[PDB]
């Protein structure tokens, strides 16, 4: 197993090669469309429902794990993302409404 590269970033690459960087959710983007689909399917009638749904997603799990990087306000107030999730949902539903 070989790589050809610049010597500077190799240092960065070395860590990666040790399989270190984990799976980290990209549901930020695909949140919206998915949410829309769910709505269409005919069950998400409230933002509470949406929040509940989101809990089953890996994004939520990721947030719970290591929040701050994922745009997160604070853990003490939310506890289990019960405001953050809402915020996300709200964001989704304004844009969706507009379209």
């Amino acid at each position: 197993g070989i790589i050809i590269t610049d010597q500077s970033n190799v240092q960065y690459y070395l860590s990666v090669l040790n399989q270190q960087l984990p799976i980290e959710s990209q549901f930020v983007s695909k949140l919206v469309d998915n949410l829309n689909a769910e709505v269409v399917a005919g069950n998400i009638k409230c933002r509470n429902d949406a929040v509940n749904w989101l809990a089953y997603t890996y994004l939520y799990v990721r947030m719970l794990a290591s929040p701050m990087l994922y745009k997160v306000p604070d853990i003490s107030s939310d506890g289990q993302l019960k405001k953050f999730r809402e915020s996300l949902v709200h964001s989704a539903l304004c844009i969706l409404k507009e379209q």
Binding site: L14, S15, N18
Partner: protein, 54 residues
Amino acid sequence: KLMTVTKVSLPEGSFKRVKPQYDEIHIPAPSKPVIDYELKEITSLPDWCQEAFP
């Protein structure tokens, strides 16, 4: 060529080489497994199941 105590040693990792053109590094093979198990044979299965691996 020579090797030095460097970043992410492990220290199971054990190679370094050099040139004035490019600084060339090698790494040995990943470790082979410790065995505290039975390599599960096929005959231990039920009858139909042994056509999993024909």
